[PDB]
Amino acid sequence: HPLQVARCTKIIKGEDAKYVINLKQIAKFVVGLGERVSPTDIEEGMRVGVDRSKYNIELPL
Amino acid sequence: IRIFRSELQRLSHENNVMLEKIKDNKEKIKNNR
Amino acid sequence: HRRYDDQLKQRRQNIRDLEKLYDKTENDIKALQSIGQLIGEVMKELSEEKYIVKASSGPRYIVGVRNSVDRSKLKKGVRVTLDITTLTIMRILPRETDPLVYNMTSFEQGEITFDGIGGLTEQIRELREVIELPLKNPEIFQRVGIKPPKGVLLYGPPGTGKTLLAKAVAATIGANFIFSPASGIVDKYIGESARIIREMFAYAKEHEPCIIFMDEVDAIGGRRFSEGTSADREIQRTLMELLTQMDGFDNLGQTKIIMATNRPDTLDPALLRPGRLDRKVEIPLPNEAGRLEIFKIHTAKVKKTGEFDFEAAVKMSDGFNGADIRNCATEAGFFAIRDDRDHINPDDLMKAVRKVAEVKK
Amino acid sequence: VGVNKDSYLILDTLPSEFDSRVKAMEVDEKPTETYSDVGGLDKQIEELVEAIVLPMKRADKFKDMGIRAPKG
Amino acid sequence: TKETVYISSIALLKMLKHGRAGVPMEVMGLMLGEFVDDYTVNVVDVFAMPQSGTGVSVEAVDDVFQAKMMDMLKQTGRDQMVVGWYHSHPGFGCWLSSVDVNTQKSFEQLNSRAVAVVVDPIQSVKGKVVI
């Protein structure tokens, strides 16, 4: 599934429920500090993933 | 003797009153994060 | 009885200690509910109730007065606080357009006082009456009707106690010493170069008294190859800026500017005119008397045995600056760890003094 | 730092997890390298140990003397 | 399709005031009133629910808060049903979010029918009100 930047355009909840990785200079989204244990998931939007460079987030889908 | 006894129950109650108050704040912080 | 007291005190101590913590978290949530507020600069003031702003968050805006606002203090390039939606003037901050913390490195006071470096005493004396007195007392120069002094020049090799004299004049005034790297004043964008000089001058008046110390005036000034065009126009733009503010309507009063140059002959003759640099101090090699006063001070603050001989070291030393005396202390100290001591002794001192002599003239 | 995206207020400060060093300086943290790559350099080794290493260890000894120590 | 939803003055005033300070983080509350037959929705009062610092959500509705305000309302003599909900949502006024559609679908099954009132506070300073 190629994604090298992954918007989900204001899916909003909240603790959490936005879970969006953007890797682009403009907008730095870090989901750091070790584990979030998930079955499959960051968040929704055809684009669960963790770009080409990973701000933690150990590799769903 | 009396003075000590009457004080002491009120002090036990005031710990609970704070425990609500801090409980509420913690909830608030969670929505914000 | 006995039981009831032991709980009561301890429970009284607990409730207070918990309470301070809980209120702090509740004040925290309050502070967080607040909403952002966009920063701009006033481009020019259009009226008394309409202003033109170049936003530092957006495009160009017309913004208005709020309540109880300062209406005659908003000038070109002062940083201002504007509301997110209201778009009216919420606050005025001091002018800033360049970091203050790396393009300007600040040393509040000086590292050393101005009578602890003693044996540079002549140079101490004539820096003290040119720089300190107009800052402290602008009134005497106004009352006579003469100009306060403009610029002062330090010349000679760096670390002849050159650096000392510059740090030291600032301490006594309680000025901020502000070291500016001249190359960094070399941005390759439109007016960045203009911007940086101006901002230091503006900040010098806000945070007054202050020393703006400009190190090397041959990366932004100097006489160049021949002053043609090879990339000698970047250098020409920088110098032109210095010359225009000094000569013009702008002036130096609680902004003192200090130039530093390896040798003074290398500087443009405009800079050599009065009305740029009136004071021109030279830094020579000290006297034997001068060396003597500097050594006694230097060796004083270092712990040493009664059998130490100041008299012997001074005699061996000729052409020594503050730095050379400092080397003799540290060199001896290598021999003093070696000789298994916790203090400096004549044996350590002689060897050290001869080695520092040998390495140089 | 953690700043809210719809409220514009600083909720928290973090440590660095990804911040630049200003990439153009090269880092080798405590490479294991010995005085036994090269022999025969004894005198220079001695000189070097006094210049940096002996002060570093006997910072205290230099403090008791009262003396300035060499940073380069 | 066509319904004249009747807004009380006090509901309006309190919605514009709150909504203007509340942005850029979304704010919601509950609308009180009555259905009368059909063709008519009367809104009588409105009260705020809490803010959340990244915007209100279906996950943020809290039934205990809404409940405790109504029960206390009753002993003045304010006895109304819920007829809907208000939300700020900048850049919504003729469009709805997919989250907001789904949110409305849960709410209207509890009521008989329900309005999603979306107020925009940006063009409420331009000599017009958008609602």
Side-chain angles (χ1 to χ4, degrees), chain A residues 5-18:
Chain A
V5 62
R7 291 180 180 183
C8 299
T9 54
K10 299 183 180 178
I11 298 170
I12 298 170
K13 296 183 181 181
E15 184 179 3
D16 293 337
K18 182 176 179 180

Side-chain angles (χ1 to χ4, degrees), chain C residues 113-185:
Chain C
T113 63
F114 58 83
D115 63 2
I117 62 170
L120 298 175
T121 314
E122 308 314 286
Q123 297 78 28
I124 293 180
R125 289 190 322 279
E126 224 252 294
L127 292 173
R128 219 188 38 61
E129 270 44 75
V130 72
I131 297 170
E132 182 177 30
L133 291 173
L135 290 172
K136 289 182 175 66
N137 184 331
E139 290 295 308
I140 293 169
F141 287 105
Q142 290 175 331
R143 290 178 179 173
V144 171
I146 193 72
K147 293 182 181 179
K150 299 296 184 180
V152 298
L153 178 66
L154 300 176
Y155 66 75
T160 60
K162 181 178 179 180
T163 298
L164 290 172
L165 290 172
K167 289 179 181 178
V169 173
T172 191
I173 293 169
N176 186 10
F177 181 80
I178 301 172
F179 180 80
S180 176
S183 294
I185 299 170

Side-chain angles (χ1 to χ4, degrees), chain B residues 9-32:
Chain B
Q9 184 65 54
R10 178 66 182 85
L11 292 173
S12 294
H13 290 296
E14 183 64 21
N15 186 63
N16 287 339
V17 171
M18 289 189 288
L19 292 173
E20 291 177 350
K21 290 179 180 178
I22 194 64
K23 182 177 179 180
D24 288 346
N25 287 340
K26 290 180 179 178
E27 291 177 350
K28 289 179 181 178
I29 292 168
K30 289 179 181 178
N31 287 339
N32 287 338

Side-chain angles (χ1 to χ4, degrees), chain E residues 111-127:
Chain E
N111 292 339
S112 294
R113 59 185 62 81
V115 298
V117 178
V118 179
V119 177
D120 184 312
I122 294 169
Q123 296 180 312
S124 65
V125 297
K126 300 301 286 193

Side-chain angles (χ1 to χ4, degrees), chain A residues 1 9 18 24 29 31 35 40 42-44 51 53-54 57:
Chain A
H1 295 289
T9 54
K18 182 176 179 180
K24 182 169 69 173
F29 297 170
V31 178
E35 292 181 14
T40 30
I42 300 300
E43 183 177 88
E44 295 181 71
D51 293 328
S53 177
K54 296 180 286 185
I57 309 301

Side-chain angles (χ1 to χ4, degrees), chain C residues 336-357:
Chain C
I337 292 168
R338 182 175 177 180
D339 292 334
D340 197 26
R341 298 291 184 270
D342 63 6
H343 63 283
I344 303 300
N345 66 75
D347 289 346
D348 288 346
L349 182 59
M350 290 188 287
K351 290 180 180 178
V353 171
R354 289 192 297 272
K355 181 178 179 180
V356 173

